[PDB]
């Protein structure tokens, strides 16, 4: 029940306390709930079937740009806010 705003502020205090992993692990969880990981998995197969040389680098050349675009905008904004909010505690108020 409107738990969004609460969850944000809570995370922020936890990360300050030394719980630094909470950012990366929380990103991971949003990506799984939304299904991002499974999509990248399939997009990878698609690329491999197209060119069919098993090479990792060239296949990463096309999978990576697309992968960064497919992350749901809510996941990117909420996670990017957590990073930004945290960074402000490391660097001067500006």
């Amino acid at each position: 029940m409107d738990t969004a705003q609460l969850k944000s502020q809570i995370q922020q205090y936890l990360v300050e306390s030394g719980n630094y992993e909470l950012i990366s692990n929380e990103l991971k969880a949003r990506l799984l709930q939304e299904g991002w990981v499974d999509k990248v998995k399939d997009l990878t197969k698609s690329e491999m079937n197209i060119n069919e040389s098993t090479n990792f680098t060239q296949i990463l050349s096309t999978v990576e740009p697309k992968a960064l675009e497919m992350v749901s905008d809510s996941t990117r904004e909420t996670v990017l806010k957590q990073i930004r909010e945290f960074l402000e505690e490391i660097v001067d108020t500006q």
């Binding site: 990248v40 990878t44 990792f56 990463l60 990576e64 992968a67 960064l68 990017l80």
Partner: peptide, 27 residues
């Protein structure tokens, strides 16, 4: 540089680390 440019540097680092792991399995 900027606080937002560093913010984006972190998120990009986190995401492309994951992406790499997924691509490397190749399946």
């Amino acid at each position: 540089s900027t606080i937002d440019s560093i913010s984006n540097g972190i998120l990009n680092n986190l995401l492309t680390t994951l992406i790499q792991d997924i691509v490397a399995r190749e399946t």
